[PDB]
Amino acid sequence: WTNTSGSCKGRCFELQEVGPPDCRCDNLCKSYSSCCHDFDELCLKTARGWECTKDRCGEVRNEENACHCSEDCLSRGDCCTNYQVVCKGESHWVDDDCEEIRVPECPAGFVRPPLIIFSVDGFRASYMKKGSKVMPNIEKLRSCGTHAPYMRPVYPTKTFPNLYTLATGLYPESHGIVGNSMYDPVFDATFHLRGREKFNHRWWGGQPLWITATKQGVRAGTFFWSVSIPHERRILTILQWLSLPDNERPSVYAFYSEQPDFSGHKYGPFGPEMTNPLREIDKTVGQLMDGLKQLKLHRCVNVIFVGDHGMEDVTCDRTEFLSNYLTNVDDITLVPGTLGRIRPKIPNNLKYDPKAIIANLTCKKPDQHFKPYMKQHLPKRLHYANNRRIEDLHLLVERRWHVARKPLCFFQGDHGFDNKVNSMQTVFVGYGPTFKYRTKVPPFENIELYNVMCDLLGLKPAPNNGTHGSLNHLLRTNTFRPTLPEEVSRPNYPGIMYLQSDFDLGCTCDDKRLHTKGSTEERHLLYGRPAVLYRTSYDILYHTDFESGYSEIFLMPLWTSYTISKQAEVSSIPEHLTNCVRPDVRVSPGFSQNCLAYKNDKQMSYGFLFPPYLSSSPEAKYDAFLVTNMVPMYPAFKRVWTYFQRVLVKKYASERNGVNVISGPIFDYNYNGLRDIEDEIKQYVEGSSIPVPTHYYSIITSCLDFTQPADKCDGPLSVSSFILPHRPDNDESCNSSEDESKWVEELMKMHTARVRDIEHLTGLDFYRKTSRSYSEILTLKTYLHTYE
Numbered sequence: 091w092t093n094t095s096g097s098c099k100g101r102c103f104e105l106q107e108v109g110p111p112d113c114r115c116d117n118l119c120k121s122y123s124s125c126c127h128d129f130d131e132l133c134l135k136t137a138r139g140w141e142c143t144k145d146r147c148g149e150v151r152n153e154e155n156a157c158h159c160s161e162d163c164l165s166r167g168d169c170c171t172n173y174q175v176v177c178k179g180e181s182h183w184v185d186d187d188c189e190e191i192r193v194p195e196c197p198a199g200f201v202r203p204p205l206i207i208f209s210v211d212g213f214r215a216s217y218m219k220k221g222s223k224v225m226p227n228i229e230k231l232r233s234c235g236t237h238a239p240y241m242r243p244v245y246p247t248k249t250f251p252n253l254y255t256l257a258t259g260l261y262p263e264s265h266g267i268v269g270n271s272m273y274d275p276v277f278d279a280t281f282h283l284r285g286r287e288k289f290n291h292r293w294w295g296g297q298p299l300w301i302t303a304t305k306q307g308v309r310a311g312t313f314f315w316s317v318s319i320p321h322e323r324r325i326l327t328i329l330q331w332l333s334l335p336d337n338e339r340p341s342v343y344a345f346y347s348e349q350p351d352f353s354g355h356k357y358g359p360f361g362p363e364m365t366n367p368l369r370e371i372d373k374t375v376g377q378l379m380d381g382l383k384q385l386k387l388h389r390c391v392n393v394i395f396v397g398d399h400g401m402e403d404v405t406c407d408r409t410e411f412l413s414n415y416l417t418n419v420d421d422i423t424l425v426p427g428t429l430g431r432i433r434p435k436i437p438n439n440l441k442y443d444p445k446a447i448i449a450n451l452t453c454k455k456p457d458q459h460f461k462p463y464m465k466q467h468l469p470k471r472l473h474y475a476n477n478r479r480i481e482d483l484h485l486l487v488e489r490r491w492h493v494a495r496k497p498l499c500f501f502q503g504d505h506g507f508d509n510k511v512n513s514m515q516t517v518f519v520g521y522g523p524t525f526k527y528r529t530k531v532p533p534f535e536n537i538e539l540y541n542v543m544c545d546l547l548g549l550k551p552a553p554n555n556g557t558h559g560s561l562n563h564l565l566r567t568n569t570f571r572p573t574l575p576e577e578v579s580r581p582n583y584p585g586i587m588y589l590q591s592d593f594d595l596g597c598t599c600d601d602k603r604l605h606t607k608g609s610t611e612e613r614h615l616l617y618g619r620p621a622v623l624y625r626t627s628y629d630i631l632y633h634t635d636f637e638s639g640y641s642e643i644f645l646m647p648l649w650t651s652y653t654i655s656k657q658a659e660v661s662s663i664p665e666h667l668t669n670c671v672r673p674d675v676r677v678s679p680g681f682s683q684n685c686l687a688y689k690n691d692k693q694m695s696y697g698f699l700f701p702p703y704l705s706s707s708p709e710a711k712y713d714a715f716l717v718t719n720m721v722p723m724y725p726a727f728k729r730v731w732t733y734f735q736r737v738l739v740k741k742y743a744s745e746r747n748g749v750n751v752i753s754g755p756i757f758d759y760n761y762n763g764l765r766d767i768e769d770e771i772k773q774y775v776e777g778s779s780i781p782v783p784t785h786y787y788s789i790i791t792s793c794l795d796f797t798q799p800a801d802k803c804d805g806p807l808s809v810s811s812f813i814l815p816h817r818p819d820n821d822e823s824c825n826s827s828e829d830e831s832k833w834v835e836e837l838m839k840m841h842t843a844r845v846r847d848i849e850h851l852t853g854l855d856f857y858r859k860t861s862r863s864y865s866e867i868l869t870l871k872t873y874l875h876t877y878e
């Protein structure tokens with residue numbers, strides 16, 4: 091119980107913690123219904139609006155006004171933001187020329203540049219193109235500070251998961267806010283964007299920026315605003331807090347606007363109606379900057395202007411209905427719209443038949459505008475599986491479409507789609523002493539920002555999913571010096587130690603300083619050997635055409651590395667070598683796979699990491715058939731892999747002036763995005779202990795300067811990578827009955843990945859020996875080739 095009888099006298103938007111029975115006056119009291127009786131009265135004044143007029147200058151201070159234009163207002167810290175322009179002949183901030191801020195220029199008492207995070211909801215990256223004609227203040231921030239062309243949100247591309255990701259540096263599967271709405275089967279409770287349950291702390295994982303700041307003795311302003319508090323008041327409040335005594339003043343502030351999201355939904359992203367809300371946001375930004383200038387803080391504070399996600403054209407006419415596919419949709423609950431999550435209407439309902447449901451949802455219409463996935467099969471780049479609040483059955487919906495349960499309009503826009511979709515990209519601008527001046531940076535992911543905000547505030551970040559240092563290039567100072575992880579397992583270099591006669595593996599090959607190092611490593615291992623960051627036992631193996639790190643535990647390479655010149659020739663597998671597998675005298679029969687298992691497993695076949703198709707000579711091709719180059723592959727997967735090995739790698743070489751390729755297996759049976767330990771592997775080749783990868787990766791590197799060959803690159807690198815799911819069928823690809831040239835690349839693009847993703851999944855550390863800085867390499871590793 092809270093005693094509302096109290097008063098907010100001299101307490102408006104106080105920063106101190108106040109719990110029952112005491113009544114509150116902070117920006118979240120209305121939301122808790124615990125405001126003092128005179129909160130609305132004393133704290134939400136509205137009299138006379140938000141701007142000084144000439145006729146108010148040098149007025150007698152009336153405490154009833156929303157803001158003041160009286161001569162004392164500056165000391166009290168509650169002038170209207172335009173007071174000086176209207177009353178003291180100053181200029182708006184926007185009208186001032188841009189000037190580089192080389193060091194913070196802060197008033198007496200300021201020890202560090204405050205950080206103000208200005209978040210806008212549903213601000214599509216492309217809105218920035220509207221420029222100073224529509225958004226002059228924002229355009230000044232963008233052009234004079236540091237900007238990316240866009241920032242990638244997390245999936246699903248909705249507000250709650252993204253704002254909390256910004257605050258924590260975590261994927262939703264880790265922070266727990268996996269949707270605007272979600273059901274937790276252990277709580278047996280439902281979280282809704284609107285409603286009381288969301289206020290319970292049990293839902294919120296990780297450690298958000300305000301807690302991190304607080305725990306390290308840095309004071310945070312509010313990161314929540316009651317919907318009823320108008321934007322102009324949020325701005326006046328932040329400015330008031332910045333005018334506080336040195337011993338009360340916060341170091342970090344957040345502003346939030348629900349626009350242009352609301353108008354985007356109503357009118358669509360390209361609607362002429364979008365101009366007004368964009369003008370209004372820019373006006374708010376100008377109030378903030380005018381206010382800061384008034385406080386002599388405009389060259390002191392760091393400002394981040396940042397969106398949570400974009401906005402797409404979506405209308406009523408583009409809705410798929412599950413009732414068209416399924417006989418009884420009244421028995422399921424669907425989280426609908428721009429994504430789908432399906433569970434039984436009755437929790438744990440035993441009659442729920444997910445295999446039959448998925449069957450009926452799989453490639454049933456030629457133009458089907460969604461695709462069902464068991465969550466473990468979703469592209470790994472989405473990182474959207476390892477949480478109990480994520481339903482097993484998911485629908486990835488096509489951009490511009492909705493999925494609904496059944497047919498039983500006022501919107502032209504929505505968002506929530508796959509986070510690589512162009513329309514979902516959002517905005518990032520940093521402006522202030524700590525950011526660079528007039529600098530553009532490549533697009534990056536919102537998970538990276540928490541580390542940077544910690545850097546900007548002198549905080550040590552809690553464990554998170556950013557890669558600390560990957561965004562050092564945004565900053566003039568306060569960069570984070572990263573440190574190369576130490577290798578845990580050194581390799582063995584096995585020489586010959588066995589004779590063909592030592593092997594009883596069931597392999598047959600109907601035909602018949604070798605494997606010494608130089609110069610294999612300098613040709614095929616361009617950026618150093620991957621460091622193995624876990625305890626295990628493996629061998630380096632050299633070959634004319636490729637090098638590998640062969641695991642004696644998992645009985646196949648952890649990685650296989652090779653270079654293909656632009657000029658390289660593709661060759662066939664000779665008829666007599668079709669089924670050729672050869673034992674490897676370098677590796678004990680006890681640490682080898684046996685072809686008997688393959689011969690005997692009627693569902694599992696095999697493939698090779700280095701493709702015989704790319705052998706340098708008929709002689710060298712024989713290396714490609716070694717048992718130590720072989721991996722277990724379903725025939726379905728082989729359709730994809732052979733096309734990749736025989737057509738695509740060469741195509742990449744030709745297009746990129748040669749490529750270096752590192753390929754290998756990934757084991758993630760528990761779908762947590764991390765290297766499986768032995769205990770967690772659940773499938774082996776029939777009758778054997780050969781483990782079956784859940785995915786196969788390839789990392790393809792070349793010279794950013796394409797005029798230089800990949801093997802002779804003097805500068806920055808270009809990288810594209812994939813994590814392909816290892817599945818017994820191609821049900822994912824609706825056109826897979828056709829020739830591979832019609833569907834394989836489409837599948838690969840969907841499963842594009844960052845090198846960093848592969849690192850988490852393999853426990854390997856790449857690019858350790860290059861001519862680039864460690865920070866540049868971290869940037870390279872977070873890169874995602876999106877194909878948009």
Ligand SMILES: *[C@@H]1O[C@H](CO)[C@@H](O[C@@H]2O[C@H](CO)[C@@H](O[C@@H]3O[C@H](CO[C@H]4O[C@H](CO)[C@@H](O)[C@H](O[C@H]5O[C@H](CO)[C@@H](O)[C@H](O)[C@@H]5O[C@H]5O[C@H](CO)[C@@H](O)[C@H](O)[C@@H]5O)[C@@H]4O)[C@@H](O)[C@H](O)[C@@H]3O)[C@H](O)[C@H]2NC(C)=O)[C@H](O)[C@H]1NC(C)=O
Nearest residue numbers: 263264265266294295296476477478553554555762763850
């Ligand atoms: C993205 O970055 C994050 C953060 O580093 C990584 O997530 C971490 O993974 C490690 C290794 O698996 C886990 O370590 C285990 O920790 C548990 C105990 O963990 C408890 O205490 C910690 C510290 O206070 C707390 O963070 C944990 O919070 C989890 O559980 C909460 C309560 O249920 C929940 O509110 C919160 O959202 C979070 O849930 C998530 O993680 C759990 C697994 O712990 C998972 O089941 C759930 O679905 C969510 O994904 C928890 O109270 C020990 O018992 C183990 O021995 C081991 O030390 C960390 O717990 C985990 N941290 C967080 C915050 O998620 C990701 O791996 C990384 N992803 C990628 C792809 O790199």
Ligand SMILES: CCCCCCCC/C=C/CCCCCCCC(=O)OC[C@@H](O)COP(=O)(O)O
Nearest residue numbers: 209248249253256257299313314315344346351
């Ligand atoms: C480190 C911080 C970076 C993030 C800063 C976050 C500031 C968050 C909050 C500020 C003020 C209080 C309210 C915050 C949540 C507002 C949620 C909401 O208003 O969503 C409305 C709507 O759009 C929801 O649906 P979608 O947009 O369709 O997903």
Ligand SMILES: *[C@@H]1O[C@H](CO)[C@@H](O[C@@H]2O[C@H](CO)[C@@H](O)[C@H](O)[C@H]2NC(C)=O)[C@H](O)[C@H]1NC(C)=O
Nearest residue numbers: 091092093094095096097110111112113126127
């Ligand atoms: C709820 O709030 C009011 C205001 O503080 C409390 O009323 C005061 O109670 C004290 C103690 O009896 C009186 O001496 C004061 O004169 C009261 N203040 C005013 C201005 O009315 C009330 O006690 C609180 N309710 C509780 C404590 O349960």
Ligand SMILES: *[C@@H]1O[C@H](CO)[C@@H](O[C@@H]2O[C@H](CO)[C@@H](O)[C@H](O)[C@H]2NC(C)=O)[C@H](O)[C@H]1NC(C)=O
Nearest residue numbers: 415416417418419443445446447448449450451
């Ligand atoms: C999957 O779709 C089929 C239709 O292709 C549904 O089949 C119907 O099933 C009911 C009883 O289950 C029969 O009376 C109808 O004759 C079937 N329709 C047709 C056109 O054959 C099936 O029910 C669907 N399964 C699920 C789980 O929704």
Ligand SMILES: [Ca+2]
Nearest residue numbers: 758764765766
């Ligand atoms: Ca795992």
Ligand SMILES: [K+]
Nearest residue numbers: 688691694695
């Ligand atoms: K077989």
Ligand code: NA
Nearest residue numbers: 820821823826
């Ligand atoms: Na198919």
Ligand SMILES: [Zn+2]
Nearest residue numbers: 211212249398
């Ligand atoms: Zn939003």
Ligand SMILES: [Zn+2]
Nearest residue numbers: 212351355505
């Ligand atoms: Zn929205």
